[PDB]
């Protein structure tokens, strides 16, 4: 009212301060992305941490610093064959301009005649789609713990005019501290106003997207609704063996809530899974505050969550031992870059 109100105002003003600077740091790196901020001979190739149809992820150690990083290698030719050029260039650009705790960290970036390299911060943990399948279902307090980090992440990402059209368990990963870290921005897009492209997994598409009349940031909030639901239920709200059918369920908008769902959870979800974006929480007059201040989040210490000072509902197993059972079988071939540039034109911006 006096000191009490002034307390909030100051806190609010500092947040306004945090996003303001963050927005500036981002804009800089965004219209003038860093390039070839490292070289291949600066790293010590330890071992293969896995592969893909694009290239392979390799564990490496910086010769000067001693730090380890996850270096994913991408064969430009394969990337082009698979038609992931735009996707890849986009993700690398967002990743080098972005910066937030629950967002994956790109440490270095470069490319040569043969590949595109992304030296990622070494993270140790599993996927969140695997743990959900394992645990089966999360308790409301646990689901809240995650949803809370997601909320902050979109608050950040939204303040940047970025729309993450790809929320889903597969894109989320739990780290060694038990906190979330979003990994995948190929679909993300910087846009003020609305955009029309249809992308993202079916069970997560907001009504407006499938309705093809354009859509804005509000779809991530609807997606937060789908995630939360899936965590607390064990399965997604809208499902069908064929996409078209899932669309019908989404656009219709008739959800079925598990009976173990607390009233608050049922209430929050009703306002997040709002078919009418104009009445959807997060896309209203109080923005993210309608979400943060909801009853279901009443016990959430946003600042603490942000600072990872809340105890994770559990920490991933991989530290302490394993007995060979933790890992096994991977391709151990050498890296051979050409003497002739490949797909030089397509990846000029990288």
Give binding residues as ranges: 49-57, 72, 121-127, 168-171
- Annotated active-site residue in 75, 166, 220, 290: 166
Q: Is the dihedral of CA 256, 260, 266, 268 positive or negative?
A: negative
Query: Could you give the CA distance from residue 128 to residue 133 in angstroms, rounded to a whole number?
Result: 9
**Quick one: resolution in A?**
2.8
Architecture of domain 33-126+323-348: 2-Layer Sandwich (3.30)
Conformational region of residue 158, where left means phi above 0, alpha means psi within -120 to 50, and beta covers everything else = alpha
CA angle (107, 85, 122) in 5-degree steps: 20
What the block records as the tokens of 85 is: 């050029």
Give binding residues for ATP as ranges: 49-57, 72, 121-127, 168-171
The residues facing 180 across adjacent strands are: 174
Among 228, 129, 120, residue whose Cα is nearest residue 169: 129
CA 34 to each of CA 17, 23, 92, 98: distance values in angstroms, whole numbers, following the listed order: 25, 17, 10, 12
Break the chain into its structural domains and give their ranges.
Answer: 10-32+127-322, 33-126+323-348
DSSP letter string, 87-129: HHHHHHHHHHH---TTB--EEEEEE-SSEEEEEEEP----BHH
- CB 203 within 8 Å of CB 268: no
CA 42 to each of CA 35, 50, 60, 108, 338: distance values in angstroms, whole numbers, following the listed order: 16, 21, 10, 11, 18
Q: Is 25 considered catalytic here? A: no
What the block records as the tokens of 106 is: 């790109």
Q: Work out the angle between the directed axes of helices 218-233 and 140-159 (0-180°, nearest 10).
A: 160
Solving technique: X-ray
Does the domain at 10-32+127-322 match CATH 3.30.70.20? Answer given as no
What the block records as the tokens of 102 is: 């629950």
């Amino acid at each position: 009212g006096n000191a009490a109100a002034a307390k909030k105002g100051s806190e609010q003003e500092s947040v306004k301060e945090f996003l303001a600077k963050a927005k500036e740091d981002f804009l800089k790196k965004w219209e003038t992305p860093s390039q070839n901020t490292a070289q291949l001979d600066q790293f010590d190739r330890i071992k293969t941490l896995g592969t893909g149809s694009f290239g392979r992820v390799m564990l490496v150690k910086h010769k000067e610093s001693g730090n380890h990083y996850a270096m994913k290698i991408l064969d430009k030719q394969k990337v082009v064959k698979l038609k992931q050029i735009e996707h890849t260039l986009n993700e690398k650009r967002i990743l080098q301009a972005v910066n937030f705790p629950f967002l994956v960290k790109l440490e270095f970036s470069f490319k040569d005649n043969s590949n595109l390299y992304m030296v990622m911060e070494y993270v140790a943990g599993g996927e969140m789609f695997s743990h959900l399948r394992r645990i089966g279902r999360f308790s409301e307090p646990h689901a809240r713990f995650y949803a809370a980090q997601i909320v902050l992440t979109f608050e950040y990402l939204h303040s940047l005019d970025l729309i993450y059209r790809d929320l889903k368990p597969e894109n989320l990963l739990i780290d060694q501290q038990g906190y979330i870290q979003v990994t995948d921005f190929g679909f993300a897009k910087r846009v003020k106003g609305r955009t029309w492209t249809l992308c993202g997994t079916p069970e997560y598409l907001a009504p407006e997207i499938i309705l093809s009349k354009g859509y804005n940031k509000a779809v991530d909030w609807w997606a937060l609704g789908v995630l939360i639901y899936q965590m607390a239920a064990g399965y997604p709200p809208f499902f069908a063996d064929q996409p078209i059918q899932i669309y019908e369920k989404i656009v219709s908008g008739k959800v079925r809530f598990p009976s173990h769902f607390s009233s608050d959870l049922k209430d929050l979800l009703r306002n997040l899974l709002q078919v009418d974006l104009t009445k959807r929480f997060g896309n209203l007059k109080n923005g993210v505050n309608d979400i943060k201040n909801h009853k279901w989040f009443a016990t959430t210490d946003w600042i603490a969550i942000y600072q990872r000072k809340v105890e994770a509902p559990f920490i991933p197993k991989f530290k302490g031992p394993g007995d060979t059972s933790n890992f096994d079988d991977y391709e151990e071939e050498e890296i051979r870059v050409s003497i002739n540039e490949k797909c030089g034109k397509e990846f000029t911006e990288f």
